[PDB]
């Protein structure tokens, strides 16, 4: 799940929702709504996936 997936990778690169959230150009909370399943298709999905080193598809449909 896109929340499990973004959380697990974030922890992995060893970042925190605020730092990730700078990399993504977004905010902590925005990164939070995401990770806590409060959003599904955020505007920065593309830019999130690139901060995470994965693909917008893997992110979406775990692949």
Partner DNA sequence: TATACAATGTATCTTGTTTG
Partner DNA sequence: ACAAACAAGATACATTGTAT
Q: By the criterion CB under 8 A, which residues form the site for its own copies?
A: 41, 43, 45-46, 56-57, 60
Tokens of 38: 């409060």
- Residue 51 has a CB neighbour count (10 Å cut-off) of 22
Please state, in angstroms and rounded to a whole number, the distance separating the CA atoms of residues 22 and 30.
11
**Of the residues 2, 6, 9, 17, which one makes contact with DNA according to CB under 7 A:** 17
Q: CA 53: distance to chain centroid?
A: 10
Q: Is 42 in the site for DNA (CB under 7 A)?
A: yes
**Of the residues 27, 53, 57, 62, which one makes contact with DNA according to CB under 7 A:** 27
Binding site for DNA (CB under 7 A): 16-18, 26-30, 32-36, 39-44
């Amino acid at each position: 799940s896109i929340s499990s997936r973004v959380k697990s990778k974030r922890i992995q690169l060893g970042l925190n929702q605020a730092e990730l959230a700078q990399k993504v150009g977004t905010t902590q909370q925005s990164i939070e709504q995401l990770e806590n399943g409060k959003t599904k298709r955020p505007r920065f999905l593309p830019e999130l996936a690139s901060a995470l080193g994965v693909s917008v598809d893997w992110l979406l449909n775990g692949t």
